[PDB]
Design a protein around this ligand. Structure first.
Ligand SMILES: [Zn+2]
Ligand SMILES: [Zn+2]
Lengths: 343, 343
C-alpha cells in the first residue's frame, strides 16, 4: 500500500515511519515542511492511506492537503487527531473517504524533543544529565498515551480495524499519573545505577516510562561501573537486586580456590557455573554424608542450595571459575543468616 | 549460660540447637528419650534456662522435670507451649521461677518429619519425588508459625525480653493460609525448574514455604538442566524469568563472533560481560554515528541497551565471551519487538 505521512519529521512521525518500514511491505511516502509542492501532490495523488500528523485567504496546510486528495480517484482513508471536527465529517460525506478522527491526549516516548514544551521529555533529558529541574506542581494529573500505543493503533487503522470507544476511534492504554509520581520514578531510575535495583516492570506506565527515560541518556553514558570485591582468592560483585525476586551476583574463583563452607536457615541460592569447571559440595548439618555436584560452563545447569545444608564451591580448572549466584533475599549484615561449618 | 532443651531430638529441638550452638556462646545441654536419669538430673540441676519441647501413680515426664528443678537453687526460667496451664502458674507461684507459657499453632520448616502427621512436611516430600498426594479439603484454614519465628522468639525469651500479646507470650508472624493455597504453591515451585520462574519473595509465607520445600529435595536432585540453544556461533541459555523484574540469560560467543544488529521499541537490556573481551556497539536508528563500548570480564560493568539504538556484540578475544543479559520483559515470539538493522 502507498501510505503518506504528513509531519513525517515530528515525534509520532519518525516512530511510525521506523516501525512501518521495519514490519510491513508498504511504500511509505514521507512529507514534511521542506517537501516541494510537486512532491506533495504526487504523493497524495497515488496514496492509498494518509496519516496526518502535521483570515484573508490563507488556507491551512490541512485544507490544502484535503483539496489535493479531492482529486485522488481511489477515495483513500485519512487518519488524524483533533487535539475543528464538524468540517472533517462534512468532507467525508461529500467525497466518500473513511476518515478516522482521534482525540489524542498528551504523548510520551523516545525521540520527543526535550526543552520544547513536552514536560516528560524535558525531565528525562535533564535528570540523566544531572540538571536542575522545575516542578511547578507535583499534584497535576496527566492524561497520557505511550508512543507504542499510538503507533500500534494507527496500524490497526491501516488495516480497517480501529479501536472504537463510544462512537470515536480511541487509542487504548491511556494513563493517569500525577507529575510527582513521574519525577519520583525518573529519579528512582537514575538511582538504580547506584543501588542495582530494577523498576516494577508489571506496571505498564512505569515500564513504558523506563524505556523512554533510557532513550535520553547521553551516548557516552550507557554503562555504569559495578562494585567488584576483589582479593587474592577472586572477586564477588553484585549485579541486580530486588525486594520480591531476590538478587543476582557474580562470583569469580581463581584456580584451586574453595569458597563457602556455610549453611543458612532460610536464605537459599541458585548457582550457575558459566565458565571454568569445579565442584559444589553439600553436607546436611546433622549428617556425615558429603554430596558432590561436578559442574562446568560446558553444560549450563543450576544447582539449588537448599536450606540446612552446609555448602562449598571449588575451582578445579586451570582457569578462573565464574559462577552466577541467585539468592532469595537481599543480603542484610545485621541478619546475615549464614553460619560457618566445614565440608 | 547453661541451657537445657528437652525433646532435643524433635523438630524445633534440632532447629533451636543448631541455631544456639552457631550464634551464641551458651552451653547447650540436650536431653531426649534415651537420656539416662543421672544425665537428666545433672543437667537440670546446673541449668540457668530450660526450653521444654518434649492414673495410678505414673507421673508425666513434664512433672518429673519440674520436681527435679524444684532442687535447682538458681530458680531458672522455664519456656514451653500449652498445645494444663493453671498447674504451671501454681508451680511458678510456689517456687519462684519465671515460666513463659506459649500457645503455638501448627508449625512448619526444615527437618520436620514427613509422613508423620505434619501435613506440610508430607506434601513437600511427596511433591519433590513425584508422589500422589491426598488433598482431603482444599478450603481448610491453617494457623501456622514458621520454625524461624519460633527459634527467634525463644532467643528473645532467653534474654528476658519475650513478645507479649494480650497477657500471653506470643510468637509473631502467624500465618493463615488454606490447604489449596499451600498445594498450589508447592506444585508451582516444582514447575519452576521447567519454566525458570521464581517465587514471590516479598510474600513472607511463600518465601518461608519455598525454603522449607527445598529442604525436602532428594540429595541427588539439587540441580536441573537448562536449555542451551547451541550452534556454531555459540549458545544462548535462559536462566531466570519473572513477570515483574524481567529475565536473565547467558550468551556465549566464540572468538570473532558478532551477534545482534537489531533495535527495539520498548524492550531494553543490560549486558554484563563476565568472561572474555569484546565490544558492544550502538547506532541511533536515524543517525550516522557508531558508538563503541569496549568491555571485558577484567572489569565488570553493565551496559544499558537503550531503546531506538541498533546494537551488536562482538568477541575480540582468543577465547569464548560470556555475557549475562538482563531484559525488561519475557520474550514473546508473537510480539518480539526486535528489528534487524546493521551496524
Ligand atoms: Zn550459601
Ligand atoms: Zn537487543
Amino acid at each position: 500500500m502507498n501510505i503518506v505521512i504528513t509531519g513525517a519529521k515530528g515525534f509520532v512521525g519518525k516512530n511510525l515511519k521506523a516501525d512501518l518500514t521495519s514490519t510491513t511491505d508498504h511504500h511509505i511516502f514521507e512529507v514534511h515542511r521542506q517537501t516541494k509542492e510537486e512532491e506533495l501532490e504526487s504523493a497524495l495523488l497515488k496514496a492509498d492511506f494518509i496519516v496526518h500528523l502535521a483570515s484573508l485567504g490563507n488556507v491551512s496546510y490541512l485544507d490544502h492537503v484535503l483539496d489535493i486528495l479531492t482529486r485522488n480517484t481511489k477515495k483513500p482513508a485519512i487518519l488524524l487527531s483533533s487535539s475543528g471536527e464538524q468540517l472533517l465529517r462534512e468532507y467525508a460525506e461529500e467525497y466518500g473517504n473513511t476518515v478516522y478522527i482521534y482525540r489524542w491526549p498528551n504523548l510520551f516516548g523516545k525521540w520527543c524533543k526535550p526543552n520544547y514544551n513536552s514536560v516528560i521529555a524535558t525531565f528525562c533529558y535533564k535528570i540523566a544529565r544531572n540538571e536542575e529541574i522545575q516542578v511547578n506542581d507535583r499534584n497535576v494529573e496527566l492524561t497520557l498515551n505511550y508512543v507504542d500505543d499510538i503507533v500500534a493503533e494507527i496500524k490497526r487503522a491501516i488495516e480497517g480495524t480501529p479501536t472504537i470507544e463510544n462512537g470515536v476511534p480511541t487509542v487504548p492504554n491511556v494513563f493517569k499519573v500525577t507529575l510527582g509520581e513521574i519525577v519520583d520514578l525518573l529519579y528512582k531510575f537514575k538511582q538504580s545505577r547506584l543501588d542495582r535495583t530494577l523498576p516494577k516492570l508489571d506496571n505498564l506506565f512505569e515500564k513504558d516510562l523506563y524505556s523512554t527515560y533510557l532513550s535520553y541518556l547521553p551516548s557516552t553514558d550507557f554503562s555504569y561501573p559495578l562494585l567488584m570485591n576483589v582479593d587474592d582468592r577472586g572477586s564477588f560483585t553484585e549485579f541486580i537486586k530486588t525486594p520480591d525476586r531476590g538478587q543476582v551476583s557474580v562470583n569469580i574463583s581463581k584456580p584451586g580456590i574453595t569458597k563457602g563452607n556455610h549453611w543458612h536457615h532460610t536464605k537459599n541460592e541458585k548457582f550457575l557455573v558459566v565458565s571454568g569447571k569445579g565442584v559444589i559440595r553439600f553436607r546436611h548439618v546433622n549428617d556425615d554424608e558429603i554430596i558432590e555436584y561436578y559442574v562446568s560452563g560446558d553444560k549450563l545447569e543450576v544447582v539449588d542450595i537448599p536450606v540446612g545444608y552446609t555448602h562449598n564451591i571449588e575451582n578445579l580448572g586451570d582457569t578462573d571459575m565464574v559462577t552466577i549466584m541467585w539468592v532469595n533475599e537481599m543480603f542484610d549484615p545485621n541478619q546475615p543468616d549464614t553460619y560457618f561449618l566445614e565440608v
